[PDB]
Amino acid sequence: ATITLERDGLQLVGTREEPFGEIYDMAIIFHGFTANRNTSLLREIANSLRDENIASVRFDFNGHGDSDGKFENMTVLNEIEDANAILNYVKTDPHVRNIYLVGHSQGGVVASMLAGLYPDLIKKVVLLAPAATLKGDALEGNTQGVTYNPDHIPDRLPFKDLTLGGFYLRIAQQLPIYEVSAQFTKPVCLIHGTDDTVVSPNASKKYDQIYQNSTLHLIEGADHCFSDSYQKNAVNLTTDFLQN
Amino acid sequence: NLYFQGMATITLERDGLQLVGTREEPFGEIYDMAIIFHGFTANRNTSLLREIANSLRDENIASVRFDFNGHGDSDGKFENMTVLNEIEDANAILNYVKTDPHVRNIYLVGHSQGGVVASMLAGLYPDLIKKVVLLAPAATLKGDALEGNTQGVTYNPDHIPDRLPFKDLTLGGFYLRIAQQLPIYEVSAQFTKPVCLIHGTDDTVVSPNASKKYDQIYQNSTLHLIEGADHCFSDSYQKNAVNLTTDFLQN
Ligand code: NA
Ligand code: NA
Ligand code: NA
Numbered sequence: 191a192t193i194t195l196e197r198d199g200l201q202l203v204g205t206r207e208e209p210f211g212e213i214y215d216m217a218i219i220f221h222g223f224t225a226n227r228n229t230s231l232l233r234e235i236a237n238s239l240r241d242e243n244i245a246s247v248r249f250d251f252n253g254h255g256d257s258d259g260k261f262e263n264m265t266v267l268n269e270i271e272d273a274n275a276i277l278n279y280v281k282t283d284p285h286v287r288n289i290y291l292v293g294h295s296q297g298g299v300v301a302s303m304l305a306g307l308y309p310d311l312i313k314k315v316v317l318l319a320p321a322a323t324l325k326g327d328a329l330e331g332n333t334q335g336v337t338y339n340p341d342h343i344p345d346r347l348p349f350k351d352l353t354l355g356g357f358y359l360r361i362a363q364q365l366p367i368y369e370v371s372a373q374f375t376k377p378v379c380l381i382h383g384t385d386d387t388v389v390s391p392n393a394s395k396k397y398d399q400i401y402q403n404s405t406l407h408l409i410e411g412a413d414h415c416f417s418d419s420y421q422k423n424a425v426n427l428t429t430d431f432l433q434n
Numbered sequence: 435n436l437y438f439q440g441m442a443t444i445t446l447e448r449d450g451l452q453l454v455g456t457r458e459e460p461f462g463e464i465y466d467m468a469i470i471f472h473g474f475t476a477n478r479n480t481s482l483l484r485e486i487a488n489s490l491r492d493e494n495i496a497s498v499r500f501d502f503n504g505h506g507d508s509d510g511k512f513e514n515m516t517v518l519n520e521i522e523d524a525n526a527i528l529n530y531v532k533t534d535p536h537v538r539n540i541y542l543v544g545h546s547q548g549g550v551v552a553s554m555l556a557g558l559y560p561d562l563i564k565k566v567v568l569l570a571p572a573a574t575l576k577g578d579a580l581e582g583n584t585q586g587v588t589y590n591p592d593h594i595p596d597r598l599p600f601k602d603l604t605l606g607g608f609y610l611r612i613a614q615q616l617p618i619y620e621v622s623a624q625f626t627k628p629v630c631l632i633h634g635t636d637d638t639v640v641s642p643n644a645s646k647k648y649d650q651i652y653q654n655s656t657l658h659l660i661e662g663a664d665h666c667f668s669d670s671y672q673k674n675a676v677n678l679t680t681d682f683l684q685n
């Protein structure tokens with residue numbers, strides 16, 4: 191049902207997907223930049239794993255969806271602290287046996303980098319279109335088509351309908367994404383479609399070259415938010431990988 | 435402001451928590467500002483932090499010092515404190531400091547762990563920060579975490595626990611994993627602007643080579659190897675550190 195946690199005086203609200211039994215494995219589903227806990231792609235990954243004896247938890251990040259916090263004061267950094275607060279709960283739960291991390295878009299950087307700091311704890315990582323391009327993007331003064339000077343990052347910038355802060359782009363510019371991630375040497379699943387416009391498939395190609403044990407799945411024709419017909423495939427690879 | 439000058443108690447907000455602080459104002463309605471960071475298990479009002487705050491005001495330079503999360507009057511469990519979220523604490527102070535009418539230039543100052551917080555925020559904010567003063571900066575903490583002995587307390591650095599008992603409190607295991615992979619030198623090195631480094635020869639807490647590696651890595655460094663001095667600039671040495679911090683920020 192709807193479960194609740196805390197990270198430095200901010201409430202983190204999530205949907206736990208629970209299977210039948212006393213002992214089960216559990217996955218932590220992280221969403222991307224401007225996304226929320228319960229979207230089509232994540233909701234179906236959440237559902238699918240439950241049918242195969244795996245539990246799951248999806249939470250809104252600080253400044254996203256139902257959780258507390260301003261979007262203005264959100265960073266990939268404070269999002270990893272959110273990711274750690276969820277892991278504190280998950281690793282302290284009596285029913286939870288083996289932990290997995292599944293991350294789409296920016297949540298793909300949040301999950302890989304959280305797995306970099308917890309390689310001894312996390313048993314598997316499924317990386318769907320990981321937004322590791324967000325560093326090289328912030329460094330060239332262009333994020334999702336919204337510009338700035340990478341040597342003059344303002345206090346706040348209008349983004350679509352929202353307003354993100356400078357500190358987000360300060361951190362993004364000097365994030366040791368691959369560095370921290372390469373610390374995770376256990377199984378990794380990489381899912382990236384050739385038709386991705388937001389995040390380049392070269393982020394997943396870079397990720398594969400740096401991992402010890404990683405499978406690269408380049409699904410021909412698949413977009414960024416793994417839409418329509420391409421969804422069931424993505425969900426199938428995540429499910430098949432997480433049980434094996 | 436010139437009217438409300440001397441000392442003040444200020445309360446900031448950072449992603450849910452409350453960071454209680456101390457503001458020292460000089461005379462005139464346009465002055466320079468120093469952000470003062472204390473180190474590991476300490477607070478904003480210790481003899482050294484108090485004498486740097488007083489001394490800079492006696493040269494008409496304002497100062498701000500806050501307790502980090504899990505320290506002093508600031509909110510949060512000591513268990514949930516990492517180096518990373520102290521930078522978040524620091525950024526929040528900078529969000530306050532950069533949006534103040536009377537603030538001419540910003541200066542970053544940090545002792546021990548505050549020194550990492552200072553070098554690491556100075557590198558994320560090079561266009562704003564004008565000068566940086568690092569007193570025995572605890573960059574060693576990363577190497578102390580890779581080894582598995584933080585301030586004498588042993589632990590497996592490959593199987594770091596959830597929480598681990600400390601001197602009087604309980605240290606979070608995510609702090610250990612955080613500092614063990616902290617890009618201290620990487621981020622620090624981005625600051626090309628003037629850096630003043632102060633380290634004690636007889637320091638057993640932070641190896642003086644931390645300030646030497648700092649000095650090495652910086653484009654505009656000035657190292658001061660105060661002889662006989664320990665980690666906490668005290669007695670015949672406090673007066674030496676406070677002056678250098680003042681004199682380098684004196685124009
Ligand atoms: Na349910
Ligand atoms: Na149990
Ligand atoms: Na970092």
